[PDB]
Amino acid sequence: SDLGKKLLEAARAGQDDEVRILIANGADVNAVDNTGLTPLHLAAVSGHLEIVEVLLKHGADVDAADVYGFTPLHLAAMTGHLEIVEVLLKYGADVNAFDMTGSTPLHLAADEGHLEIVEVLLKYGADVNAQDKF
Amino acid sequence: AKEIPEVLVDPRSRRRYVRGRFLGKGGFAKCFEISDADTKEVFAGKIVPKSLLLKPHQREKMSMEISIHRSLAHQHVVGFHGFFEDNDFVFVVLELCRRRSLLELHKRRKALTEPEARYYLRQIVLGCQYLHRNRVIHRDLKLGNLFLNEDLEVKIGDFGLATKVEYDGERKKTLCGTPNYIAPEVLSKKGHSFEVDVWSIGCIMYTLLVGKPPFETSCLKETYLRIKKNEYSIPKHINPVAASLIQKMLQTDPTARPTINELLNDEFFTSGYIPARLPITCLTIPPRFS
Numbered sequence A: 001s002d003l004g005k006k007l008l009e010a011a012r013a014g015q016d017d018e019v020r021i022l023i024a025n026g027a028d029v030n031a032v033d034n035t036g037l038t039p040l041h042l043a044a045v046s047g048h049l050e051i052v053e054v055l056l057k058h059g060a061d062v063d064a065a066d067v068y069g070f071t072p073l074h075l076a077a078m079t080g081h082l083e084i085v086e087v088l089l090k091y092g093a094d095v096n097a098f099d100m101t102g103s104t105p106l107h108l109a110a111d112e113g114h115l116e117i118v119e120v121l122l123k124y125g126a127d128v129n130a131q132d133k134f
Numbered sequence B: 001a002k003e004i005p006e007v008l009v010d011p012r013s014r015r016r017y018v019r020g021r022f023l024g025k026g027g028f029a030k031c032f033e034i035s036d037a038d039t040k041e042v043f044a045g046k047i048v049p050k051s052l053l054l055k056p057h058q059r060e061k062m063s064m065e066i067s068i069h070r071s072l073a074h075q076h077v078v079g080f081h082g083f084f085e086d087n088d089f090v091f092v093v094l095e096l097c098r099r100r101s102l103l104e105l106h107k108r109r110k111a112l113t114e115p116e117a118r119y120y121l122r123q124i125v126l127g128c129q130y131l132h133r134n135r136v137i138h139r140d141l142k143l144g145n146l147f148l149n150e151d152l153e154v155k156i157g158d159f160g161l162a163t164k165v166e167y168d169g170e171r172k173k174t175l176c177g178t179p180n181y182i183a184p185e186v187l188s189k190k191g192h193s194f195e196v197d198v199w200s201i202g203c204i205m206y207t208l209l210v211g212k213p214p215f216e217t218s219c220l221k222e223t224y225l226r227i228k229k230n231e232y233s234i235p236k237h238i239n240p241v242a243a244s245l246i247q248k249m250l251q252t253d254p255t256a257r258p259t260i261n262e263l264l265n266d267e268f269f270t271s272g273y274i275p276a277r278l279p280i281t282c283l284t285i286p287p288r289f290s
């Protein structure tokens, strides 16, 4: 998709108005790049709160996993974007989602010293003993 | 063509490994997450159908990968846990590298900052120095077999094109496949040795700092002519010490490149900041003090 590639670029670059236009013109909000990043992943990790909300309202898959197993919540938690962490949880993000190391958004936030995020994730039911099994 | 058993049984130990998710494939191999049904320990299982091993150069590749890798143990080499077979498949049990490879990092980041290039390149060169001192030439170093563990530590893998040097000054004359970064002496009749690994590290260094490959164009013929003629350009924004080290490694005459130890001791490795740890954000977006 040409609109898919354009929407990925707009979301990464934080171009709010270019994102609203592409969506209105038929852009796949669930477009995926060559390592599984979606527009929501790219807005989340770049700190673009308005684009995160726009994407979620236009049906963005809140638990889309990239080639590391990161959800947009993993990326928001490791980069310290508290408002995006909250918006994602409100849109039903799995607070205990596991990446391919068995790490939750909480493990990643703790490792990066984002202790405000650690506190918020514990508030929305993050389990410190979350364990991935086979 | 045979389905892979859902449970891998080692006929020696009788350890059972449950087959989980597909991880990757290339040549005759697929790789899967596998777990000890008893200990719950998780490995990468490389699985190769004997239907793809009927030719001499293919049986050679599988056997050579196993005999070379099983003899290796280093901080910067993929852990080798074992190998076994049934009637239809060869199974190789490896260390699972949960943070993918420098290929995935490259596709997301393109050009790294210099400190991050310095962090990764030192680990590549240490792993390769351990290989060269054990008389192992890898011959196929590429972003995709420079694996990362949970600590973003580089692990060299995929020893399928590797060879053992049997005597001093030996020039190997054959390869059982086509290397990713073709050294000019591989394109010639004169044979090759350890210095193909230094060429490939030069290509990887250029790619990490520049964000594209030094020789690759659309036409394999144009590419090979560029290699033979040593035609490439280092953009002007690369620091001089880094540019100079790319030029030492990307030379036509293999005797003029640095040895793996001379490469490890290059000024590049000491000329700027040496990160202790990279943050996990470095897989997706640039770092500041790194």
Ligand SMILES: CCN1C(=O)C(/C=N/c2ccnc(N(C)C3CCN(C)CC3)c2)=[SH]C/1=C(/C#N)C(=O)NCC(F)(F)F
Pocket: A065, A066, A067, A068, A069, A100, B021, B022, B023, B024, B025, B026, B027, B029, B030, B031, B044, B046, B078, B094, B095, B096, B097, B098, B099, B100, B147, B157, B158
């Ligand atoms: C060194 C051992 N090794 C690994 O540890 C590999 C790890 N790959 C991983 C690790 C974590 N996640 C994935 N995913 C695909 C996930 C699936 C779920 N999804 C949501 C997220 C991604 C893949 S691949 C490998 C190889 C070796 N040797 C190998 O690929 N070799 C080349 C071959 F196959 F060509 F023979």
